[PDB]
Amino acid sequence: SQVFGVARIYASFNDTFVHVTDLSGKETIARVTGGMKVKADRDESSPYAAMLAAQDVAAKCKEVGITAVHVKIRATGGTRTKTPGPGGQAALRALARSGLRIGRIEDVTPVPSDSTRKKGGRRGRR
RNA sequence: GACCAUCGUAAUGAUUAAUAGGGACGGUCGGGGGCAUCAGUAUUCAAUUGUCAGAGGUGAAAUUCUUGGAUUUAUUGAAGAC
């Protein structure tokens, strides 16, 4: 038998979050960000930061007795970028290499039916 | 000469139907209009949630929010717009 958690990977262009919960999603088991592992604000989204965050989450998951994780990848979404940030892929690869069994992978990036006005002018960032 | 009847003669008297226009009729077509009426996810916020240091934001920083629990996570809501 295998104990399943849910790895919510939030990958933005500024930071990466590796957040493991129960299947209900109410109880957090482990939460680590890229900025927890690197001291420089520019490197919080980096693939390296995301790897270190994922490794630490995986250690804590083993202590609690989680053997397997469902992956929910999330970009910023809404009125912002729907592309996941650079550490999304690195975090996932790190979780797999740490010896957690990867279950189902889903994209849960929030997509509007139609949107409130995006930030920027009509002339855009310049 | 006017004028009103009645009989008579006559092929008795209405040009097409514009690859002009209008109108009717027929089945349709359309993100055309108006008034009601349905959803939709998102965004912000607020109740209940777990969690533990950063989260935000950038070319790089700072302003800002934060161990009274941010951000992240789930649950049920409202609001307005689209």
Curated annotation (Swiss-Prot):
Cited Pfam families: Ribosomal_S11
A GO term from the CC aspect: cytosol
One of the GO biological process terms: maturation of SSU-rRNA
Transmembrane segments annotated in the record for this chain: none
PROSITE patterns linked to this entry: RIBOSOMAL_S11
InterPro entries per record: Ribosomal_uS11, Ribosomal_uS11_CS, Ribosomal_uS11_sf
Locations listed in the record: Cytoplasm; Nucleus, Nucleolus
NCBIfam families listed in its UniProt record: PRK09607.1
Assembly mode: Component of the small ribosomal subunit (SSU). Mature yeast ribosomes consist of a small (40S) and a large (60S) subunit. The 40S small subunit contains 1 molecule of ribosomal RNA (18S rRNA) and 33 different proteins (encoded by 57 genes). The large 60S subunit contains 3 rRNA molecules (25S, 5.8S and 5S rRNA) and 46 different proteins (encoded by 81 genes). uS11 interacts with eS1 forming part of the mRNA exit tunnel. uS11 interacts with snoRNA U3. uS11 interacts with MPP10. Component of the ribosomal small subunit (SSU) processome composed of at least 40 protein subunits and snoRNA U3.
Biological role stated in the UniProt entry: Component of the ribosome, a large ribonucleoprotein complex responsible for the synthesis of proteins in the cell. The small ribosomal subunit (SSU) binds messenger RNAs (mRNAs) and translates the encoded message by selecting cognate aminoacyl-transfer RNA (tRNA) molecules. The large subunit (LSU) contains the ribosomal catalytic site termed the peptidyl transferase center (PTC), which catalyzes the formation of peptide bonds, thereby polymerizing the amino acids delivered by tRNAs into a polypeptide chain.
Family (UniProt): Belongs to the universal ribosomal protein uS11 family.
Protein name: Small ribosomal subunit protein uS11B
Source organism of this protein record: Saccharomyces cerevisiae (strain ATCC 204508 / S288c) (Baker's yeast)
